[PDB]
Amino acid sequence: MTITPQNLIALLPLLIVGLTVVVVMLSIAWRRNHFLNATLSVIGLNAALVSLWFVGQAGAMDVTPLMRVDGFAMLYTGLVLLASLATCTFAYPWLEGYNDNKDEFYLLVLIAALGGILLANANHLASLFLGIELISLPLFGLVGYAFRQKRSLEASIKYTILSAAASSFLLFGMALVYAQSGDLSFVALGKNLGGMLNEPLLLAGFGLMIVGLGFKLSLVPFHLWTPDVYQGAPAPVSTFLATASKIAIFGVVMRLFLYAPVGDSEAIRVVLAIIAFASIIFGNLMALSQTNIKRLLGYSSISHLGYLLVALIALQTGEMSMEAVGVYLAGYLFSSLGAFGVVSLMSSPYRGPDADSLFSYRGLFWHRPILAAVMTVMMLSLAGIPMTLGFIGKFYVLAVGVQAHLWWLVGAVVVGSAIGLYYYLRVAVSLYLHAPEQPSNWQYSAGGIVVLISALLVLVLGVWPQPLISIVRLAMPLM
Amino acid sequence: MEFAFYICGLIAILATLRVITHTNPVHALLYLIISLLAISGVFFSLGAYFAGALEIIVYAGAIMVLFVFVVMMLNLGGSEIEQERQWLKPQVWIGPAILSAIMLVVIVYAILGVNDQGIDGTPISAKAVGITLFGPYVLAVELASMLLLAGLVVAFHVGREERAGEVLSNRKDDS
Amino acid sequence: MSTSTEVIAHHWAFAIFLIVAIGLCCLMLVGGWFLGGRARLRLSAKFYLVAMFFVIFDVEALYLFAWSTSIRESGWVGFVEAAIFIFVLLAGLVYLVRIGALDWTP
Amino acid sequence: WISPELIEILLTILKAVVILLVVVTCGAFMSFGERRLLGLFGGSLQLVADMIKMFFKEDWIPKFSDRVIFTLAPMIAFTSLLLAFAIVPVSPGWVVADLNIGILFFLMMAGLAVYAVLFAGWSSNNKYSLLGAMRASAQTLSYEVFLGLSLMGVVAQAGSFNMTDIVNSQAHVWNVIPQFFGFITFAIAGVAVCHRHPFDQPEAEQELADGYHIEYSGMKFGLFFVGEYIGIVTISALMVTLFFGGWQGPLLPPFIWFALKTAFFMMMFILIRASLPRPRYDQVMSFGWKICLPLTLINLLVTAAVILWQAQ
Amino acid sequence: MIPLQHGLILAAILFVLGLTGLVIRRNLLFMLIGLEIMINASALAFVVAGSYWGQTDGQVMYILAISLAAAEASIGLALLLQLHRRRQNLNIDSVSEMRG
Helix, strand or coil, rough: CCCCCCCCCHHHHHHHHHHHHHHHHHHHCCCCCCHHHHHHHHHHHHHHHHHHHHHHCCEECCCCCCCCEEEHHHHHHHHHHHHHHHHHHHHHHHCCCCCCCCCHHHHHHHHHHHHHHHHHHHEEEHHHHHHHHHHHHHHHHHHHCCCCCHHHHHHHHHHHHHHHHHHHHHHHHHHHHHHHHHCCCCCCCCCCCCCCCCCHHHHHHHHHHHHHHHCCCCCHHHHHHHHHHHHCCCCHHHHHHHHHHHHHHHHHHHHHHHHHHHHHHCCCCHHHHHHHHHHHHHHHHHHHCCCCCHHHHHHHHHHHHHHHHHHHHCCHHHHCCCHHHHHHHHHHHHHHHHHHHHHHHHHCCCCCCCCCCCCCCHHEEECCCHHHHHHHHHEEEEEECCCCCCHHHHHHHHCCCHHHHCCHHHHHHHHHHHHHHHHHHHHHCCCCCCCCCCCHHHHHHHHHHHHHHHHHHHHHHHHHHHHHHHHHHHHCCCC | CCHHHHHHHHHHHHHHHHHHCCHHHHHHHHHHHHHHHHHHHHHHHEEHHHHHHHHHHHHHHHHHHHHHHHHHCCCCCCCCCCCCHHHHCCCHHHHHHHHHHHHHHHHHHHCCCCCCEECCCCCCCCCHHHHHHHCCCHHHHHHHHHHHHHHHHHHHHHHHCCCCCEEEEEEEEHH | CCCCCCHHHHHHHHHHHHHHHHHHHHHHHHHEEEEEECEEEEEECHHHHHHHHHHHHHHHHHHHHHHHHHHCCCCHHHHHHHHHHHHHHHHHHHHHHHCCCCCCCC | CCCCHHHHHHHHHHHHHHHHHHHHHHHHHHHHHHHHHCCCCCCCCCHHHHHHHCCCCCCCCCCCCHHHHHHHHHHHHHHHHHHCCCCCCCCCCCCCCCCCCCCCHHHHCCCCCCCHHHHHHHHHCCCCCCCHHHHHHHHHHHHHCCHHHHHHHHHHCCCEEEEEEEEHHCCCCCCCCCCHHHHHHHHHHHHHHHHCCCCCCCCHHHCCCCCCCCCCCCCHHHHCCCCCCCHHHHHHHHHHHHHCCCCCCCCCCHHHHHHHHHHHHHHHHHHHHCCCCCCHHHHHHHHHHHCHHHHHHHHHHHHHHHHHCCCC | CCCHHHHHHHHHHHHHHHHHHHHHHHHHHHHHHHHHHHHHHHHHHHHHHCCCCCHHHCCCCCCCHHHHHHHHHHHHHHHHHHHHHCCCCCCCCCCCCCCC
C-alpha cells in the first residue's frame, strides 16, 4: 500500500521526532552545546504534542499494513512524548555535572521516544518487533551512559544480554506464528482457524512471544532483570524505562491481543492468568524487604504490570478493560514520574563515578520538604490509596477483574495491595524521620515544578477523575 | 536440491555444536562462519537467494569480522577460563542441556501435526523483496535506519578509548 | 530447479568450478608439503570503531542493495523514502566526521 | 552412455576448467608483466622456475601456532577472489555462473576476503604482524564499505544483479560515461580490497606493526601472491563488464574484445602503480570515508533521479 | 519438495543449541556468540516460513533480524571491550555486585 499525502498528517509526531533527531544530530556535529541541544529536543517533543493535536483534528487511519493511527495510538503516543519530556527535564541537572559527552543522551531519548510512538502506532508484527528494539537499543545507551560507574555497566550488561535473548525468543515466536498463519498483520493471525483455534504451532509461537514481551513487562519468571536494571541505571534513565517503555510495550501487547482472534483462546488466557497471579504476588512479596528505593520501585513495576495483566485478561468480556488500562496507565505514569523525578533531583548531579549513588530517603523532609511531600504523594498514589489517581486505576482494574469473574486474580490483587502498602507507606513515613547526616539552578527548578504539576495532577484526578475518563473514552480505537 | 538442504542443515547443526563446546574462541568463530555458510546454503536451497546473499555479505561478512576484530584486538585467547574447563563437567553441562532438550522436545512436538504443502521452487528474487521493502514497508526501512543510527551512537559512546596510541596496556579502570 | 537442461548444466559447471578450485588449492598445498625435503596488552578502540562503522553502514547499504533492484518498479515515493534514508544516513556520517570518530591522527 | 545432454554438460564442465586455468595463467602473466614493465622506469620461464622453487622447498609450521587457520588463510586469499570470477561473462555462451544474484556473489567473496588477513594475523604468533593485519583489515573494511554502493550505481542503472542483464543494458552506451564517479570509486575500492600498491604495507607508518605476509614461507606466501593477482585481474574483469562494454565490439570476436579490454585495464593498473606515490594512513582513512562514501551515495541519488526522470 | 517441519525443526535445534551455549558458558564473548546463534535461528525460521507461503515478508523480517543482530552485536562487543578495559576479565559471574 502506497502512502497518500492525506496519510502524511497522521505520521506527524513520528516525523517531527525523526526530524528533531536529525536536527539535534547536526547541532551536536556543529557546536556541541548542551543547553541548545536540550532546548531543541524539548521543542521537538512539544511540537510533536501539538502535531498530535493536529492528528486529532484528522480521523483514524490505516496508513500501511505496518501502522494504524487512532485514539488508542494517540493517547499512548502522547504519554510517550510527555514521559520523554519529563526524562529530558530530569536529565539536564543530572547531565550538568557530567564529564564526558552530554548530548547523545538526548539523541537516544528522542530515538527511544520515536520507537515508543511506533509501538503505540503498531498494527503489525514487524512494527511491534522494530518498536521494541527501538526502545531497547537507546535503553542500552541510556543505562550504560555512566559506564565509568561499576553498577551502571553491570546493569547495561544484564539488560543487553537478557533483552537480546528476549528479542530472539520473540522473533522465533513470530516466525512460528507466521509459519502457522500466512500473514503478519494482527487481525490475520487466526483467520484461517475456525473449535480449531488452539493450533499447537500458533500457541507455541504466541507462548514464545509472551516470553519475549513479558521480559519487557517484567512478568515472572522473566522479572529478575528488573531491580538490577532499575538500580544500576541513572535515575532519569530509570524514569524513562519505568514509564515510557512499559507503557508502549503494554499498549502494543493489548492491541495485539485485541485485534488478533487468538485472545479468545482458553489456554493463552489461563497462562496469562497464572503469570499475572504469580507476578503480583512475587513482586509485592519481593519488595517487602527492600531498603533501596530503586529496587523497590522495580518490584513495584513488576506488581503494577501484574495489575495491568489482570486488567488485560478481561479484554474480551468486560469491554471496559481498554479504558481501565488507559486510566491506570496515566495514573502509573504520573506516579512513577513524580517518584523517579524526586529520585533524580536528589541524585543530581552525577558527582563522578566513584561517588555512591544512594538515594537515602530518610530525613528528606528536613532540607527539601517539597520533594518529600511530592514523594509521599507518589507513594500514596502507587499504593492504591484514595485522593490519588492510582486509586482510580486500582478501582478500574478491580472492576475489570470482578466483571469477568476473575476471582483468583481479584483476590491476588487485594492480597498484593495489602502486602504492598506496607513498604509504600513505610517509605512514605521514613522520608519524614530524622537523618543522621546529609540546588538553585533554573532547570533544577524546572524539574521541581514538573514533579509539582505531577503531584497536583494526581491529587486533582484522584479527587476528580472525570476529565481523564472523558478523554480516555473519547480515544476509542477501531473495534 | 533437497539433498543440498539436508547436508547444509546437518553440517550447520554439527558446526554450531562444535561452536558451543569449543575451548579457544577463534576456532569457535571459524566454525560459526562455516555454520553461517551452511545456513546460507539452506537459504539458497529454499529459493531465498537474497537471504543467503545477505548472510555471507553481512552475517558472515560483517558480524563475525567484528567478533574476530575484538578477539584479536584485546588479545583474548580464552585464557583463565580454558584452564578451568567447567563446561566439560557433568554438574554444569547436564542441567541446562536437559532443560534445553526439554524445550526442544516440546517445541518439535508443536512443530509436528501442522499441515504441509511442502517447499516448492519459484525462488524469491531480490527484485520482489525490493518492491515489498519500499512498498508497504516504508516505515520499516526508515525506523531501521534510525535503529542502526542509535546502535552506532551507543557503541561509539561506550566503545571509544579517549586515550592515545595504537597500543595500550590493560591498566585497571584506565587510571 | 533440476529439469531445464541448461541451467542444470550451469549449476554443474558452478559446483565443479568450486570443487576443482578448492581441490587445486589443496593439491598445491599438498605438493608444497610433500616435495622439497626436510632438514597484558590491548590494541585500541579505533579499530572497533571503524569495524562498527563498516557493519552499520553495511546494513544501511544492504537497504540500498534491495532498493536498487526495484528502482524503476517503485515510483517517486520510493525515491522520496530512499532520499530521506540517505539523508539521515549522511547526517549520521557527517556527525561522525564533525565529532572526530572518523579520523586517525597518528 | 553418450547422450546429447551429457555431451552438453561435459562441454560446460570443460569450459569451466578452461576458464579457471586461463584466469590462473593470466594472473601469473600479470605477475610476470609487473616484473617486466616496472624495470624500464623470452623471460616467461622464470615464472615456472620460481614455481618449481616454491614447490621444492621445506615448509614451515610455527611450533607455537595452530596448523588449520595458518594453512587456511592462504586458502581464503586464493579461492575467495578466485570464485569471485565465476560470475563474469566473457562471451554469449562461455559463462559458468548465470545465477540471479550476479554481483552479490562478488560482494560475498569480497566480504570473506578479509578473513585471510585476520587469520594470518592471529595464527602468526607475532604481535607486530598481528597489529599490521589489524591495520590492513581496518583499511579494507573502510574501503569496502562503499564498494556495494559504487556497484549499486550500475545495478540501479540496469535494474538487475545478473551480469548478462548488465551487458545487455550496456547495448547502446557504456556505463563509464554516465557514472564516472561510480567508476573511480569502484576502481579505488577494488584496488584497496585487493591490497594493491597504494593501499599496501599499512604497517609502514609504524614500527610496532609488521606485515601479515611475514612468517609464511614457500607455497603459502606464493598462494597469497597469486591470490592477490587473480583478485586484481577479476576486479579488472568486473570493472570492464560493469562499466565498459562487456564482450561488445565492432569487428573483433567478443572474447577477444573482452581479453583486450581486460589487459588494457591491467596496463592501466601497472601505470597507476608506476605513477601515484604511497599515501600515509590518515588520508587513506579520511579519503575512504569522507570523500568516498558521500560521493557514491550522491551518485546513487542522482542516478535514481535521472532514471526516474526519463521513465517511459 | 521439502516439508516445512524439517526446516522448522532445524531452526528449533539451532535456537536450542544457542540457548545452551548462552547458559552453560561463563565467557561473555561466548554468550554473545550464542545470542547471534539464536538470532540466526530465528531469522532462518522466518525465512523458512516466508518461503513456504511464497511471500517476501519473511525475507523482510530476515533483514530486520540481521539489522538488529548487527546493531546489538555492536552493542554487546562495545560493552565487552569496556568490561575488559575496566575489570580486566571477561567473566560474567564476577560482575554480580548488584544482588537482591
